[PDB]
Scaffold this active site. Structure first.
Site, PDB file in Angstrom:
ATOM      1  N   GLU A  57       0.830  -1.094   0.126  1.00 34.48           N
ATOM      2  CA  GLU A  57       0.050  -0.123   0.083  1.00 34.48           C
ATOM      3  C   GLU A  57       0.779   1.264  -0.105  1.00 34.48           C
ATOM      4  OE1 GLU A  57      -1.669  -0.413   4.373  1.00 34.48           O
ATOM      5  OE2 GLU A  57      -1.321   1.631   3.787  1.00 34.48           O
ATOM      6  N   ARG A  68      -2.273  11.876   6.944  1.00 35.03           N
ATOM      7  CA  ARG A  68      -2.038  10.930   5.743  1.00 35.03           C
ATOM      8  C   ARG A  68      -3.522  10.781   4.962  1.00 35.03           C
ATOM      9  NH1 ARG A  68      -1.005   4.381   6.089  1.00 35.03           N
ATOM     10  NH2 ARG A  68       0.186   4.357   3.946  1.00 35.03           N
ATOM     11  N   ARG A  72      -5.500   5.901  -0.801  1.00 36.87           N
ATOM     12  CA  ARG A  72      -4.264   4.706  -0.870  1.00 36.87           C
ATOM     13  C   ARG A  72      -4.394   4.181  -2.531  1.00 36.87           C
ATOM     14  NH1 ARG A  72      -3.851   6.863   3.358  1.00 36.87           N
ATOM     15  NH2 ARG A  72      -3.809   5.803   5.403  1.00 36.87           N
ATOM     16  N   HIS A  88     -10.056   4.746   3.414  1.00 42.03           N
ATOM     17  CA  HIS A  88      -9.472   4.097   4.117  1.00 42.03           C
ATOM     18  C   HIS A  88      -9.887   2.437   4.372  1.00 42.03           C
ATOM     19  CE1 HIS A  88      -7.590   6.845   7.170  1.00 42.03           C
ATOM     20  NE2 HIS A  88      -8.928   7.838   6.702  1.00 42.03           N
TER      21      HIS A  88
END
Ligand SMILES: [Li+]
Length: 99
Positions: A57, A68, A72, A88
């Site tokens: 990831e 953050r 992703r 997430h």
């Protein structure tokens, strides 16, 4: 239950930061966050089942996030096997490089 395929998102529809991420993966970094590059365990079974170490990831920067954040790219081992999550890891879409 089980499902035959993950849904898709056109490469061209990804946020530009996700393109930056894909480029950083190609170039081996540099990565903005310490957890970039860790193994992704796919514990919820949202992606095809494989052995530990198949997936990794990487952060996709969220513009204006001081942390953050939720986005992703998860890479798989096969050619063009890249997945995007904007939430997430609650859901993924496979990047379709042809559109
Ligand atoms: Li890649």
């Amino acid at each position: 239950a089980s499902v035959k395929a993950v849904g898709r998102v056109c490469y061209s529809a990804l946020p530009s930061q996700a393109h930056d991420t894909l480029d950083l993966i190609d170039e081996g970094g540099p990565f903005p966050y310490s957890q970039d590059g860790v193994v992704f365990q796919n514990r919820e079974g949202l992606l095809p089942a494989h052995s530990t170490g198949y997936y990794h990831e990487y952060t996709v920067i969220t513009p204006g996030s001081p942390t953050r954040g939720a986005r992703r790219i998860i890479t798989g081992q096969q050619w063009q096997e890249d997945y995007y999550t904007a939430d997430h890891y609650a859901s993924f879409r496979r990047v379709d490089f042809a559109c």
